[PDB]
């Protein structure tokens, strides 16, 4: 019986890892889902039994693998998995109700009764922690780790300390398989928390607090893109602190190792603002134009799951080709380079108006300026370029398409 | 580690690898480098079978006889430089 479910587990696991290693977009997904439904049916069949002990560690490993699969295929979490955790915990405690934080502490006492499952349990806590970290449940997360370790760790209220303290308990002896273990978890958790912490402290004007955690990220598990982001972040921190040469090196290193160098050129232009090297600014961003034109998963937890998306305040956010050609032409004109900013705005205006057949450029929306203001800026670029006869064409086109902007159009028309 | 020679990590597992010596260095932290002073040629493998498990998944070992790549490349370079210098 147990023999059969165990074979089943190991079978589906090796199947999963084969899809990971080999396979195309079709067969990877096909084998994945086949295994996933196998796991589902297995899980439910196991729920078919009331509580008894020797099933629990296997049961836990199984649900764990299930969740891992599920979120790796979803590329994003859900609270269905939290319900799966809830259900498992109750299944356990029935051997010997209220709310997750009570569940967890009762369960940690239940494991402190020393049934040999704690490797599984710790993997699972890592999972639940990943949930709570994508969900920003850091308060209860701290309490949970304090209960995990001794309560003597009550004042160590920096989560990074308790993350380091979380001892994955065992060498994982001859057991049901898994896609992942508490070690490979803990590394991803440490890097992600440190990365989030560092970005928040940067955005809140603490570029001295920031560098501590940002280097703590590169010191440990760090896929090459995570490295690129950390280096752009350290360069921006150096700009805030006023280290306009030191930032260049970190940005140069992200250029070397990275194949995704929009944010680097962005921060470089943000630093040529700081220095007034605005020719370098404009040229870095002329390069960024071409940079943005350019473009795998695994059946496991990764370090891309536990990232928040690029927020505008963060230095890593990038406008689209059009959003940023706008900034190119804008800062070009502000520099007093109308002959160039005008052509920039021309190509940018056609990027939206002439965009019918290919991929249509996203709308500016409330944060971005409304579509008519760019017509005025374009006409002023033309006018300062002495492009008067064509500024009239732009004005005529505008009033064909359809306030202060009408009078402004009249004024620019007269100026032409 | 040895404090006067800290580019060494004597291993102390009280099993089968005991006695073993290693080193480690790291240039462009992708392209690392490792050296083993192991007792015989089983505990030259057992190392690798214990290890290559642990790694990243595309971590691409290889053995060396003749020198590190960068060193040997510079060394070829130098000869070619001189040679063409003399032929010029």
């Amino acid at each position: 019986c147990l023999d059969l479910w165990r074979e089943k587990n190991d079978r589906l696991v090796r199947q999963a890892k084969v899809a990971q290693n080999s396979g195309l977009t079709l067969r990877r997904q096909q084998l994945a889902q086949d295994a996933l439904e196998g796991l589902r049916g297995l899980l439910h069949s196991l729920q078919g039994l009331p509580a008894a002990v020797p099933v629990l560690p296997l049961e836990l490993t199984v649900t764990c693998n299930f969740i891992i699969l599920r979120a790796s295929l979803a590329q994003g979490f859900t609270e269905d998995q939290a319900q799966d955790i809830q259900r498992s915990l109750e299944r356990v405690l029935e051997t010997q109700e209220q709310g997750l934080r009570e569940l967890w502490d009762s369960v940690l006492r239940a494991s402190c009764l020393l049934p040999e499952l704690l490797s599984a349990l710790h993997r699972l806590v890592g999972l639940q922690a990943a949930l709570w970290l994508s969900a920003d449940r850091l308060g209860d997360l701290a309490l949970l780790l304090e209960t995990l370790n001794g309560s003597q760790s009550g004042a160590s209220k920096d989560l990074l300390l308790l993350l380091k303290t979380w001892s994955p308990p065992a060498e994982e002896l001859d057991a049901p398989l898994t896609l992942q273990d508490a070690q490979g978890l803990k590394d991803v958790l440490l890097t992600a928390f440190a990365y989030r912490q560092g970005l928040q402290e940067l955005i809140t004007g603490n570029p001295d607090k920031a560098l501590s955690s940002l280097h703590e990220a590169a010191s440990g598990l760090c896929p090459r893109p995570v490295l690129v982001q950390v280096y752009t972040a350290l360069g921006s921190c150096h700009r805030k602190m006023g280290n306009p040469q030191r930032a260049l090196l970190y940005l140069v290193a992200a250029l070397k190792e990275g194949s995704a160098w929009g944010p680097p050129l962005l921060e470089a232009s943000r630093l040529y603002q700081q220095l007034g090297d605005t020719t370098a600014e404009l040229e870095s961003l002329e390069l960024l134009v071409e940079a943005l034109n350019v473009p795998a998963p695994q059946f496991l937890i990764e370090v891309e799951l536990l990232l928040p998306p690029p927020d505008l305040a963060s230095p890593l956010h990038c406008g689209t080709q059009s959003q940023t050609k706008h900034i190119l032409a804008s800062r070009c004109l502000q520099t007093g380079r109308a002959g160039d900013a005008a052509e920039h705005y021309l190509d940018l205006l056609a990027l939206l108006l002439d965009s019918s057949e290919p991929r249509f450029s996203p709308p500016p929306s409330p944060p971005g300026p409304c579509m008519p203001e760019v017509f005025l800026e374009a006409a002023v670029a033309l006018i300062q370029a002495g492009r008067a006869q064509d500024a009239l064409t732009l004005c005529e086109e505008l009033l064909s398409r359809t306030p202060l902007w009408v009078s402004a159009t009249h004024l620019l028309q007269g100026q032409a | 580690i040895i404090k006067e020679f800290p580019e060494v990590y004597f291993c102390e597992r009280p099993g089968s690898f005991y006695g073993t010596l290693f080193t480690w260095k790291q240039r462009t932290p992708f392209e690392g480098i490792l050296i083993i002073y192991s007792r015989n040629q089983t505990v030259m493998f057992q190392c690798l079978h214990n290890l290559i498990r642990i790694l990243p998944i595309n971590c691409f070992l290889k053995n060396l006889k003749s020198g590190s790549e960068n060193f040997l490349i510079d060394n070829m370079a130098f000869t070619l430089e001189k040679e063409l210098v003399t032929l010029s």
Partner: protein, 56 residues
């Protein structure tokens, strides 16, 4: 004969400047020390060795 010598002069010169650039990129970590640099050098070795050392 001067004719031969000037040919060999320029023909080595060009390779020399190429290697000089490659050494610059090595110093600066620009392209890579990875591989195919190897082969790109051995190509040069083979452009050399064929009528190597005509002793007349």
């Amino acid at each position: 004969r001067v004719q031969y010598l000037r040919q060999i002069h320029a023909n080595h010169e060009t390779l020399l400047r190429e290697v000089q650039t490659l050494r610059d990129r090595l110093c600066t970590e620009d392209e890579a020390s990875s591989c195919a640099t190897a082969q790109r050098l051995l190509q040069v070795y083979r452009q050399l060795r064929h009528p190597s050392l005509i002793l007349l």
